[PDB]
Amino acid sequence: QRVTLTNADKVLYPATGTTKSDIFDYYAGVAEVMLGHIAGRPATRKRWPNGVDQPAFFEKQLALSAPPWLSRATVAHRSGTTTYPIIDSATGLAWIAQQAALEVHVPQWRFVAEPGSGELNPGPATRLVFDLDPGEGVMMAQLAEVARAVRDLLADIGLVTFPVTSGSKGLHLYTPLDEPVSSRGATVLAKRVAQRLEQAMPALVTSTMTKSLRAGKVFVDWSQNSGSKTTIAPYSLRGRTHPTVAAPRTWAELDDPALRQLSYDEVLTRIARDGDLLERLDA
Ligand SMILES: Nc1nc2c(ncn2[C@@H]2O[C@H](COP(=O)(O)OP(=O)(O)OP(=O)(O)O)[C@@H](O)[C@H]2O)c(=O)[nH]1
């Protein structure tokens, strides 16, 4: 289990001078809190080899050159088969940094080992996710109000919801599923939540993607519960002008109208103070 960090001094975020080495330091720093929420999941790497002012790609297939110690599993998609890495150790996060994989994206299900053969196949959804996107003119205050409304509807079912500022423009919400549920079943439940909210507050919420009608509304994207979709991992850096993070928040923080995205240094400071706000999500 060995990684050599090359171009450690290469700036990946020109705006802030943040380097590959800084990204390595960050991922080392968040390893203990981040690994639980990506354990057992295929990791998709969004890479910016020349930094955030240069092109990115969304890399799913594991390269032939990938180190032999990386855990991996295969997924049959509608075209064929893809081998993914599974990130489950500090060394794995060191590899992520070396790859300039600023963002780590995962589905809401984990691999499960076969009864007799120990072969890894996709298992049930372990959590629901909601991806909340602000339409034009929509401020953080409205995103937070809609997030509370999602939380309340799920609370009517005895489900708990954890808020995450995405690091980009919106909010992500996670709710742990106590009993096993298929990704199909998860997508149905999430869609019904979204639709219920849109019916209750059609001027403030939409459950459909079409952008012509998104202005003034929060689009509550329920579709990333699909087995074939991903959502950025909690604690992931973002490939944006600033090295912001998909940062777990408290509901009390969401009562602040000045609510904003957090930078990676802030997230480290918060972990030092409070540990993992998502500790109960994948326990
Ligand atoms: N195919 C593909 N999917 C992507 C790519 N980048 C992100 N995704 C996925 O597309 C969806 C939206 O991702 P993003 O655009 O990063 O949105 P976000 O993290 O919710 O950030 P904001 O909406 O800006 O707050 C998620 O399902 C991601 O896993 C990409 O380059 N290619």
Ligand SMILES: [Mn+2]
């Ligand atoms: Mn979004």
